Amino acid sequence: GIDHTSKQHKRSGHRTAPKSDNVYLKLLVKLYTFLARRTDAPFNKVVLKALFLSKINRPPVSVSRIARALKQEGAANKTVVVVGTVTDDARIFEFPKTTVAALRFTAGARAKIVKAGGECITLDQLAVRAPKGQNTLILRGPRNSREAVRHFGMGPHKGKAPRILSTGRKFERARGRRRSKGFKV
Amino acid sequence: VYKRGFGKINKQRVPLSDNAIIEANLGKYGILSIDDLIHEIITVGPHFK
Amino acid sequence: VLKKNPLKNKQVLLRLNPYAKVFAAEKLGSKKAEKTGTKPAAVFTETLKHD
RNA sequence: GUGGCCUAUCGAUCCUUUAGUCCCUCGGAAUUUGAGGCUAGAGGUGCCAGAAAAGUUACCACAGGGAUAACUGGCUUGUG
RNA sequence: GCCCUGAAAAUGGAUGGCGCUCAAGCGUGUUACCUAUACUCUACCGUCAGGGUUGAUAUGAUGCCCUGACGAGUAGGCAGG
RNA sequence: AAAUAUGUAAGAAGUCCUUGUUACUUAAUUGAACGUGGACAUUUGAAUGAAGAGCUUUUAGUGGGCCAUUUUUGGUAAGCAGAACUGGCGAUGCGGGAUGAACCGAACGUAGAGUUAAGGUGCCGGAAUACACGCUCAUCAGACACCACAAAAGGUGUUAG
RNA sequence: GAAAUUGUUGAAAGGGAAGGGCAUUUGAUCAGACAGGCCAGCAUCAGUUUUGGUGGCAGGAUAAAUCCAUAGGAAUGUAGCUUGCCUCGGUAAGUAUUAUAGCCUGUGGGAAUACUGCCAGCUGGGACUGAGGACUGCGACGUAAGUCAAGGAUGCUGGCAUAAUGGUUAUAUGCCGCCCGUCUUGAAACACGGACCAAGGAGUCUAACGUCUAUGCGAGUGUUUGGGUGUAAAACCCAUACGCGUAAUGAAAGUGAACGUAGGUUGGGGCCUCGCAAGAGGUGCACAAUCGACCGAUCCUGAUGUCUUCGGAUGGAUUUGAGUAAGAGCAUAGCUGUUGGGACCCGAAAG
Ligand SMILES: [Cl-]
Ligand SMILES: [Cl-]
Ligand SMILES: [Mg+2]
Ligand SMILES: [Mg+2]
Ligand SMILES: [Mg+2]
Ligand SMILES: [Mg+2]
Ligand SMILES: [Mg+2]
Ligand SMILES: [Mg+2]
Ligand SMILES: [Mg+2]
Ligand SMILES: [Mg+2]
Ligand SMILES: [Mg+2]
Ligand SMILES: [Mg+2]
Ligand SMILES: [Mg+2]
Ligand SMILES: [Mg+2]
Ligand SMILES: [Mg+2]
Ligand SMILES: [Mg+2]
Ligand SMILES: [Mg+2]
Ligand SMILES: [Mg+2]
Ligand SMILES: [Mg+2]
Ligand SMILES: [Mg+2]
Ligand SMILES: [Mg+2]
Ligand SMILES: [Mg+2]
Ligand SMILES: [Mg+2]
Ligand SMILES: [Mg+2]
């Protein structure tokens, strides 16, 4: 007998492979598995793990977010790397001439980058140009702006959004939400 | 130590079958042989822990 | 693949501890002690035999 | 000094009513009555997180319960 | 201290039984010996963890291989068949 | 006025020096709070350990319990009723207590060899009818924890004081 | 032409049930290789372990004793001596401290042995195991070539090649084994259902949803109400709307999200500069804590101007919101969870 201080036969809890069956996505995983093993470059390990993420863990990154990151000191000529989808943003009226590597580009995003003089490349093209992630900049989208997050942690004095179907005067604004009706939260 | 001596390397139990593994893990403390490890134990030295 | 115990396998005992050859050659395990003739004081002997 | 020297002395929704703001609405357009909203109290639930409620069955019924009484048996022995 | 008196219940009866009296009883001391799915070493199965390996011309990179640890289970959950 | 339990601290979000902001505060640039700039590295502030730490979403079953040591209330008492801490049974086989949910030992993939635990070694029954010093003779001897009971009071039985 | 159940024939067991588990004997029956298959013996090694013989050292009161030398002392008093009875030497009690026996205590001297411990000392017997499969490592022995017990067994030999080993099955023997399902703190229970066999027999579908995941497109998204078309309930093509999302906040009238590189501070992966490295510096997305700014509500302050009661500029407030602050959603599919439906299946007394 052994006095165990922790649970036995416990899985790591991290994804070691993508859950999807996309054949082309598996090829990229195979490419960066080889690179992460034989380069000791921190960039390759980050990209490989990002390929395993689910859809909600890879929020879209707009071109306006890309332009803002290029305005950082000394980042004007760096290659923007997004493991996910790059979307278009019409709220911005000026775009730089950078190089962007991403899994997917929307029609508007690709046209806007090319019209400004830049180029859109895939992740395998990035590996040929920068096998060790030279002069790269990794951008991630916002996870907590998702609609589902605002309902998490509901309770008294928490200031979270209730799970409701119809919003209006007669829908959960009575007793429990104002002092004139019993009490307020 | 000679009969039932095992070292903890990378969270694994490794037999102390050669002086090379001891040096590779305790060399920075000046311990480079099985007798050096024994000396650090019987005489409670600075690197006993 | 197989742990061989030193102190019963002489070849393994020689791979570790290169001093085992010198220890056996000079018979350090049966080293004699220099003879000394110091004797305890009377107070020690009387206390030992005291009721 | 924001009641009683301290440790108890008390009450939601709906409805009614009062005070305040004299503000918002009555949706074809206006004025005046009336009604409806906004903020703060009172009318009470003592089964006190708050259903509106008398008996009887020896004519009886159903779902269950050894989670539970009316025999033995077992533990205990005050009492005998 | 040991033993005895004090010591009366209902089918036949139980230091478990036989039986045991310088014990095979009671108190105490010293050694030898017996045996668990426990402990030590080895093999095999599975699980988990840390690693190696895409180079064509021979087939599975969910492949192959190296190292270490671990394994009870109702209600219940998940996974591979 | 204990014992056992119990709060906090043992550094980088720290210490030291100089001086910037304000409608707060002071008789007063006085103070308070937050800062700019400079110095001090991991024997950087006790020990041991650390199958890595931190964090989030969602949902199952359950919401009759019971037992043992110690503390403890009601009751003459109860295999009675009710609490405290911990370990157990329930959910658990295996060796031992003849037999037993809870006691003792020890927790379990399939096998081989070795050594043990608790408990035992006259026979049933694997293992000394072993060794050593005493005690006991019962016309109802005695024989091993939980545990399956015995008291007050007595004996010129025998032993030691 | 299955099972329950039955007849005949054949085989086997049976002293108050039968059935089962581990192991082997016996009977019956049977597959695999004969191209090295089956079963064994010895030797030399490796791993684990069990039981003996024997050697060298260390420690203590540098064991204590014995033994030896010397001084003193006594009785459970040796020799000698006295005394009284005594089958001519045997006791009996007085004296007497080594004499014709001895013992005790102290001091001095030199060893041995016991006990405990150590040896990188040697050596005999027994049991179990042989995992791996070109080489690579670390050592040992040697001037060297090389060898070796050094990162896991090889060498030699014999019998048999078939029911001999082994598998299956029946039986016997040793030890062990209470009836399953169920409720329960607790079931072998004197708790409930079950005589036997076959077939049937219980978490389904739908509307609307939560989390998670996959897919398409993405500030958008959804062709299938309908129209066009057709090899005709399929596939293919399409306009306008509509739904959800892209703005919130108030009961409402209403109003409506940049002082600033879309803010400051602290911690941050990755990247950049230097450095052999360690480190230092720069930039820092996501995310976490905090201080501000912006929009709506509430309570105040009330400018220039006026249908003199309209208008609400500006500046605040331990107040408040499911907000803003370089968008993330829409659609389809799947497991799990929720509600209404007969709603996992069967069951009331009633109305
Ligand atoms: Cl039998
Ligand atoms: Cl409003
Ligand atoms: Mg008063
Ligand atoms: Mg007061
Ligand atoms: Mg009208
Ligand atoms: Mg109540
Ligand atoms: Mg009962
Ligand atoms: Mg009485
Ligand atoms: Mg005895
Ligand atoms: Mg298990
Ligand atoms: Mg239960
Ligand atoms: Mg018993
Ligand atoms: Mg026997
Ligand atoms: Mg027919
Ligand atoms: Mg038949
Ligand atoms: Mg056979
Ligand atoms: Mg039995
Ligand atoms: Mg019951
Ligand atoms: Mg049962
Ligand atoms: Mg029933
Ligand atoms: Mg029946
Ligand atoms: Mg059927
Ligand atoms: Mg019905
Ligand atoms: Mg009715």
**Residue A117, C-beta contacts closer than 8 angstroms, at least 6 positions apart:** A97
Return the residue of B nearest to C1 by Cα. Answer: B15
Contacts of A90 (CB under 8 A, 6+ apart): A108
Q: A142 CA to middle of ligand 18, Å?
A: 60
How were these coordinates obtained? cryo-EM
* Residue the block writes with tokens 């102190």: C7
Compute the distance between CA of residue A71 and CA of residue A94 in angstroms, rounded to an integer.
Answer: 12
Rounded distance between C-alpha atoms, residue A157 and residue A154, angstroms: 9
A78 CA distance to ligand 24 middle (Å): 82
- Chain B residues whose beta carbon lies within 8 Å of the beta carbon of residue C5: 2-3
- The identity of residue B34, as a single letter, is I
Residue of A165, A160, A140, A157 lying closest to A149 (CA atoms): A160
Q: Where are the domains of chain A?
A: 14-145
In the 8-state DSSP scheme, what is residue C4?
Answer: P
Structure token digits, residue A67:
């332009």
Nucleotide minimizing C1' to CA distance for residue A137: G271
Residues 6+ apart with CB under 8 A from B40: B29, B31, B47, B48
**Which one-letter DSSP state was computed for residue C47?**
H
Following DSSP, what letter does each residue of A110-129 receive, concatenated? HHHHHHTT-EEE-HHHHHHH
* Domain range A14-145, CATH class: alpha beta
Alpha carbon distance A105, A63 (integer Å)? 10
Q: Tell me how far apart the alpha carbons of residues A121 and A54 are, in angstroms, rounded to a whole number.
A: 22
Return the closest nucleotide (C1') to the Cα of A133.
G271
Cβ within 8 Å of residue A95, ≥6 positions away: A63, A67, A112, A113, A115, A116, A118
C-alpha to C-alpha distance for A61 and A84, rounded to whole angstroms: 8
